[PDB]
Amino acid sequence: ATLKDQLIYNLLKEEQTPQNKITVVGVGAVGMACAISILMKDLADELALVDVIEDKLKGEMMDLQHGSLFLRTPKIVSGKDYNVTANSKLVIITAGARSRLNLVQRNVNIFKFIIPNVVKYSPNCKLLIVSNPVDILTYVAWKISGFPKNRVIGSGCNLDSARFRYLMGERLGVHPLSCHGWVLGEHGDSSVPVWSGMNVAGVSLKTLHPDLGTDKDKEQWKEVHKQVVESAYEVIKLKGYTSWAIGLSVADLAESIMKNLRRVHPVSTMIKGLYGIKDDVFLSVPCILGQNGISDLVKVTLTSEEEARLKKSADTLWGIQKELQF
Amino acid sequence: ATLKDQLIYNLLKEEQTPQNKITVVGVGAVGMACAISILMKDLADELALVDVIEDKLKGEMMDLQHGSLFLRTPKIVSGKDYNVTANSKLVIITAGARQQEGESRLNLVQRNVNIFKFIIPNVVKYSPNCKLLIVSNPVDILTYVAWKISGFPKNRVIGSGCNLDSARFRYLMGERLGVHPLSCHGWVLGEHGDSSVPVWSGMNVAGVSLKTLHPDLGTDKDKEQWKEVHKQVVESAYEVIKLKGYTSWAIGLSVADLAESIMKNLRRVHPVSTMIKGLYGIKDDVFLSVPCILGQNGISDLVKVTLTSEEEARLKKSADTLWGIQKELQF
Amino acid sequence: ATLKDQLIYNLLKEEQTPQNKITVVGVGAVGMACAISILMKDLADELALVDVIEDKLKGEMMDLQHGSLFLRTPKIVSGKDYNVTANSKLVIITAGARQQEGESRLNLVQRNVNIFKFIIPNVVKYSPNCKLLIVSNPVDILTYVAWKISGFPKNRVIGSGCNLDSARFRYLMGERLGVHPLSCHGWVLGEHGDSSVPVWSGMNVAGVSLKTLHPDLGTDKDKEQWKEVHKQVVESAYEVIKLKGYTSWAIGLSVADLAESIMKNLRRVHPVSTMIKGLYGIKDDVFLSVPCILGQNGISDLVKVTLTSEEEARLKKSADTLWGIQKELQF
Amino acid sequence: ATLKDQLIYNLLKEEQTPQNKITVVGVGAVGMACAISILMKDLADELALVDVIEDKLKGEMMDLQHGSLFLRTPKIVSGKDYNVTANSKLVIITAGARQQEGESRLNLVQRNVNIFKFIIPNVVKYSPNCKLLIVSNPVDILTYVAWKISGFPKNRVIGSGCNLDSARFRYLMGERLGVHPLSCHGWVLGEHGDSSVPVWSGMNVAGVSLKTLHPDLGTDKDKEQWKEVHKQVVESAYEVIKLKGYTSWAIGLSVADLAESIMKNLRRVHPVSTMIKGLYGIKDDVFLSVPCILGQNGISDLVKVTLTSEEEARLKKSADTLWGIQKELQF
Ligand SMILES: NC(=O)C1=CN([C@@H]2O[C@H](COP(=O)(O)OP(=O)(O)OC[C@H]3O[C@@H](n4cnc5c(N)ncnc54)[C@H](O)[C@@H]3O)[C@@H](O)[C@H]2O)C=CC1
Ligand SMILES: NC(=O)C1=CN([C@@H]2O[C@H](COP(=O)(O)OP(=O)(O)OC[C@H]3O[C@@H](n4cnc5c(N)ncnc54)[C@H](O)[C@@H]3O)[C@@H](O)[C@H]2O)C=CC1
Ligand SMILES: NC(=O)C1=CN([C@@H]2O[C@H](COP(=O)(O)OP(=O)(O)OC[C@H]3O[C@@H](n4cnc5c(N)ncnc54)[C@H](O)[C@@H]3O)[C@@H](O)[C@H]2O)C=CC1
Numbered sequence A: 001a002t003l004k005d006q007l008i009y010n011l012l013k014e015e016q017t018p019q020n021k022i023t024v025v026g027v028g029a030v031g032m033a034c035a036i037s038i039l040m041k042d043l044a045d046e047l048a049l050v051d052v053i054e055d056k057l058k059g060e061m062m063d064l065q066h067g068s069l070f071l072r073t074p075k076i077v078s079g080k081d082y083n084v085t086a087n088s089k090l091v092i093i094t095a096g097a098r099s100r101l102n103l104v105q106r107n108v109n110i111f112k113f114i115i116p117n118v119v120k121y122s123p124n125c126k127l128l129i130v131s132n133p134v135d136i137l138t139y140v141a142w143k144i145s146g147f148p149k150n151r152v153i154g155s156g157c158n159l160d161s162a163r164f165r166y167l168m169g170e171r172l173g174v175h176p177l178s179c180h181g182w183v184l185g186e187h188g189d190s191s192v193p194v195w196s197g198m199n200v201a202g203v204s205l206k207t208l209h210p211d212l213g214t215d216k217d218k219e220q221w222k223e224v225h226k227q228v229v230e231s232a233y234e235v236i237k238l239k240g241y242t243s244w245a246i247g248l249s250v251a252d253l254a255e256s257i258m259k260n261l262r263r264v265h266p267v268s269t270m271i272k273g274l275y276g277i278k279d280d281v282f283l284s285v286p287c288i289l290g291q292n293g294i295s296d297l298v299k300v301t302l303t304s305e306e307e308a309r310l311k312k313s314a315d316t317l318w319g320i321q322k323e324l325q326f
Numbered sequence B, C, D: 001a002t003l004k005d006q007l008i009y010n011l012l013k014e015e016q017t018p019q020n021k022i023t024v025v026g027v028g029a030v031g032m033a034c035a036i037s038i039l040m041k042d043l044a045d046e047l048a049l050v051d052v053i054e055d056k057l058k059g060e061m062m063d064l065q066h067g068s069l070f071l072r073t074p075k076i077v078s079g080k081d082y083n084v085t086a087n088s089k090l091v092i093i094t095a096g097a098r099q100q101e102g103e104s105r106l107n108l109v110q111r112n113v114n115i116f117k118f119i120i121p122n123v124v125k126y127s128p129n130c131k132l133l134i135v136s137n138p139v140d141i142l143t144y145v146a147w148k149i150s151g152f153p154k155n156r157v158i159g160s161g162c163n164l165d166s167a168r169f170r171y172l173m174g175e176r177l178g179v180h181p182l183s184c185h186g187w188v189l190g191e192h193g194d195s196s197v198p199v200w201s202g203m204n205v206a207g208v209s210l211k212t213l214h215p216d217l218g219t220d221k222d223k224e225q226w227k228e229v230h231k232q233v234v235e236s237a238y239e240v241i242k243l244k245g246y247t248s249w250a251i252g253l254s255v256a257d258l259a260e261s262i263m264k265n266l267r268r269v270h271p272v273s274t275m276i277k278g279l280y281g282i283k284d285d286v287f288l289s290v291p292c293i294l295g296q297n298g299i300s301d302l303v304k305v306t307l308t309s310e311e312e313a314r315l316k317k318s319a320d321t322l323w324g325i326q327k328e329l330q331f
């Protein structure tokens, strides 16, 4: 018989449906950073990669597979066909392009193909949307998939808040893990730094320093949030794109989802009902993440100005959204 | 009183050196895969990055920094100037030209040797007690070059070598046998390149010799053509390069595997590029992979593999080929 | 208008079924060491503890829970009633009675049978599809007992067997050679404890066979007395018990390693106790350790190790002894 | 030659000191919990254990060693003689007496002072530059004793203090809110144990102050009696002890978390016991818990929490009480 059969006696020939499977759709810079970060955190027992560029997709799969000895994810697969994504617990969408409106429409056209395919093979997965513009595309994925809002999550301001805490820790000489602060609302340009919640060891910086984040602030802490916004552009300008930070951010979200941790993360969720907002829009607020996606959200007390900014974002997003062609 | 002063009382200042600093030279596809892997393995308390392309360097540094919340490495720095690398315990060199589709790693010698002539003395100046881990291709030749230029004892000059080839081999073995690569044991030695040598005589699962079970294993007569598995290992980089343009993730993980053994003084055995003079009647100062014990002083010991007459001939051929190249280098 | 409602808006209250649940039955030193190791390796999303000693049980649960901030297992439960164990992927049995001075093997085994007669039906009731991992001694016999009572297929009943014996062997081997145990390979098979069998032919570093280098290895003509390494594997277990009263840490770590392969579907090879009828020469329903492929279905395959005449005879004798005892048991 | 010499060619003999060494003094339930958690977090390249009970010490050491295959800490040692602790970066003291029937609390305190009178000089002798982490109770008093005896600067003497109390508080908060403790923020400061102070103003999720949302929080008029949460923090300490006889897992995990920040120079903030003279009107040499930045040189900075008059008066009362005891201790 074969060497295998001489070496190994078989008790039974499998095979179970995937138990802890994650799919990443789009193997560009962001998708692959998510993939490697998820692999090194041992979050999945099966990883599937999808893309439309077939040679790239195969080469990325093979590169990862060659590192199998150093990982604890025993099955890595890829394909243009969504059959490879069947029974995923979590499906991460990083596909797309990176004026504006026509760009949104290009990514919407992409989602019109991707989302139905995802749902067909994993009708009960959680969807985590990373593609930009992320808040708008999370709404698009929600409408197309027909999923309940708990199962559709935008990476949203998780990255923005990580940047903010990195910058805060640099200023204070404290690890980011111990520097707490929340950036909410729209990802990117219009995000909102919640000054009232910035604290170390529960000590409110705003209470110590009333001018915190105002124009008159002798220390111009507002510049920290300015950097949060601008640093996103600077990284793209410097290396051409961003990958590592978003990959790590996404793996953190995936960790709460896959392990049912119920930690709180600022991610994009359907916010209709809050802050005078009455349109189907997705904005980041702090959400409890677990095996059922977003099960709960924190109602952050916002100032008048902060609420106004979220409202303005909602209006803008809805304005774009009600013109999109599905 | 500033906000910081209101919030935090300082007991004492003055800086201290990092305990476990790693530098990566070259922030291209390979350097950054090494960086992320090392970061996610929590091996370093400081990571330094160096490159000659200043915008790319700063951008890569910043991208990693923005991921700090999710890491356990509190300081990430970068610069074109090697002062950013001072006091490194381990310095990983990934800079230089890579082989294009259909090009041999051996075609990169002039380019990369010349780059090493600038890099290595700079590294040594700022971290005279570091271990050097060479990744740039052709890796065996460049380990020899790094060793010669640095003036380090050879224990502290390590080539990533066949750790990756052996990983690939065990991956493919595991796919054939239906076993995780961790449980499939098999060694690929010699050149990290076309002349590498699969040690059929040592392949096993649970200590059961595959060659004993299957005498034709690895030969031309083999009905299961296991030699094709080694051919796949040889061709793997070329195939991945044809498909995605370069290789990155597997070598990044391989390097982090080696870094872990060194930084944590594990004394695990890995096939890495080192001087093999004195083994198998080889008299030249040739570098290529054999199994080595890796720890805090780098390579402390070599494991002497018993090769068949056929395996030993192939290894000697690999050594002959590589020494033909090394010997013509001028320093 | 409770603080919770002011603070948190609930989107839905649904389902909430554990996806990666593990139960430990028995919270003595072994059970709790398995528990802490499993927690620190992030293997489970829910951990359940069962024992008949209620105060001890609640105390252990609370002590683990108070450490929740430092763990990534969000739900830890306990109870004397098996409803707490519902929907476990893996159920680890460390419960049983300790042998009394002068008590016969049969009397001790029978008491454990009687204990398993209460435990196993309750486990099966609540997790009909779980894998069972038996740790309780005598482990080879009690693995058989759990298989008989549960009615589970062979693949889902696993004895920790010689997993710990082999880890001890590799520690001792590593110490002699100055190599990390990860890189020292060697297999102790058959009966856990006194009658275990060291497979000298498989002992190697980097695929280099120690027996081939040193043909007297393991014999009485061996001037280096490598046989003493296996004698230490056997004696070290008793020595630890005499010194600290019990063993806990090493068994905890070994069980966590098995749980990792099972929970993550790794298909790594481990030396564990499995129903060995029809193989290695044996015709009775007995469980002994051989290298087994472990993953999400428990033991899906096993490795057929080539044994010397002596090694084979030792396994056969163990099988004869085990069946001699088992055939007298009252179920 | 020997088998070892046939198998392995040595390049280097010269060994080097362990570079990230941790010692645990006292191998009771607390000490061994600290040990296993530190081992499973890969914080140390060498672990030393010290106790006065020789058989127990050796057995614990061996049990850990036997688990080496599953660990990344290549050297574990033990001894009654403190030479085994030489060159430790961090030394964790969990050694203590047990109060006896009829014994006064002050008498028990002095018996632990007498224990430290022997331990601390020995630790200082072999690791004059280490950080001391005091866990032994009464922890705040004994941290002062260790500081006084050692002559170390305040940054290198750290009491476990309210690290555990705070972890318990966050666990309980998390249960009430249905949120992971990692995302539930709240600080218990001052004295470890009975007289600890829950800082209501700092309790939050996502930076949303519970005290602002719910002004009655932490008062007797609290319709939800959140004060009961802190009551459970103190009460649960006694309940675990009553139920299982001692506490181990939670303290061990909390100590490993502190060790992680120190060994990896993270500069995270933890509630630990430190010299507070000069704060809150306190003018005596007393150690109480406040949030401290922990890194390579121990406590480099502390956070100056804004406290209510009532909260400030509790710490002052605690300091007066502790000083009154300390001035009467016999050194
Ligand atoms: N939410 C956030 O914080 C961040 C979001 N991003 C976004 O992530 C997206 C990707 O970024 P990059 O990876 O740098 O772009 P990229 O161009 O390198 O990769 C995109 C990949 O999507 C693939 N793709 C295109 N159409 C597809 C389809 N119909 N099905 C499957 N795959 C398809 C492309 O072939 C390409 O490989 C962009 O939208 C970018 O703006 C980037 C950084 C941060
Ligand atoms: N040992 C192994 O198994 C593998 C080795 N490699 C080798 O690694 C090397 C790098 O590959 P990639 O990162 O894909 O190339 P890359 O082109 O993406 O990056 C190379 C980087 O080296 C930098 N560099 C060039 N000269 C420099 C100097 N004097 N100082 C500092 N930096 C300098 C470049 O600016 C560039 O950023 C190649 O030689 C490649 O063949 C690649 C894969 C595997
Ligand atoms: N397979 C191996 O390599 C090793 C196996 N062991 C075995 O593991 C077993 C446990 O060891 P220890 O924890 O030290 O003993 P232990 O006596 O400290 O703990 C046993 C626990 O089982 C509980 N128990 C008894 N009857 C029960 C029932 N009907 N249901 C639930 N729980 C019950 C006891 O109350 C006790 O808490 C022993 O049989 C020991 O020999 C120990 C070391 C190694």
Ligand SMILES: NC(=O)C1=CN([C@@H]2O[C@H](COP(=O)(O)OP(=O)(O)OC[C@H]3O[C@@H](n4cnc5c(N)ncnc54)[C@H](O)[C@@H]3O)[C@@H](O)[C@H]2O)C=CC1
Pocket: D025, D026, D027, D028, D029, D030, D031, D050, D051, D052, D053, D094, D095, D096, D097, D098, D115, D118, D119, D134, D135, D136, D137, D138, D139, D160, D161, D164, D192, D246, D247, D251
């Ligand atoms: N700070 C905290 O949050 C907590 C502190 N603790 C304290 O930790 C200490 C230890 O707790 P357990 O491990 O349960 O006590 P234990 O009595 O079980 O173990 C104490 C060990 O200290 C050893 N020891 C006594 N004198 C010694 C000496 N001169 N040199 C070396 N070792 C010596 C004993 O021999 C014994 O092995 C106690 O003081 C306890 O109160 C306990 C729980 C929490």
Ligand SMILES: C[C@@H](Sc1nc(-c2ccc(Cl)c(Cl)c2)c(C#N)c(=O)[nH]1)C(=O)Nc1ccc(S(N)(=O)=O)cc1
Pocket: A097, A098, A099, A100, A101, A103, A104, A132, A133, A134, A135, A136, A137, A186, A187, A188, A189, A190, A229, A232, A233, A317
């Ligand atoms: C900081 C830039 S960096 C950046 N931005 C974009 C981007 C974002 C939004 C739009 Cl509308 C367009 Cl056209 C491009 C792309 C891309 N692609 C990219 O690769 N990088 C960014 O992400 N801006 C941003 C603005 C609004 C939204 S939202 N609230 O409408 O969802 C999302 C993102």
Ligand SMILES: C[C@@H](Sc1nc(-c2ccc(Cl)c(Cl)c2)c(C#N)c(=O)[nH]1)C(=O)Nc1ccc(S(N)(=O)=O)cc1
Pocket: C097, C098, C099, C104, C105, C108, C109, C137, C138, C139, C140, C141, C142, C191, C192, C193, C194, C234, C237, C238
């Ligand atoms: C090394 C001791 S340490 C030890 N051994 C025992 C033990 C083991 C077997 C028997 Cl038959 C008895 Cl009566 C006691 C107990 C217990 N209880 C204990 O607490 N510690 C041991 O586990 N021996 C052992 C012998 C035979 C078997 S088997 N092949 O029959 O399953 C399993 C183990």
Ligand SMILES: C[C@@H](Sc1nc(-c2ccc(Cl)c(Cl)c2)c(C#N)c(=O)[nH]1)C(=O)Nc1ccc(S(N)(=O)=O)cc1
Pocket: D096, D097, D098, D099, D104, D105, D106, D108, D109, D137, D138, D139, D140, D141, D142, D191, D192, D193, D194, D234, D237, D238, D322
């Ligand atoms: C909740 C008990 S649980 C407990 N408490 C004690 C204990 C604590 C304090 C004293 Cl003064 C005495 Cl005599 C015993 C022991 C012990 N041993 C034990 O094993 N468990 C506790 O730890 N109390 C405690 C009180 C005061 C201090 S302080 N601020 O004066 O240092 C520290 C701890």
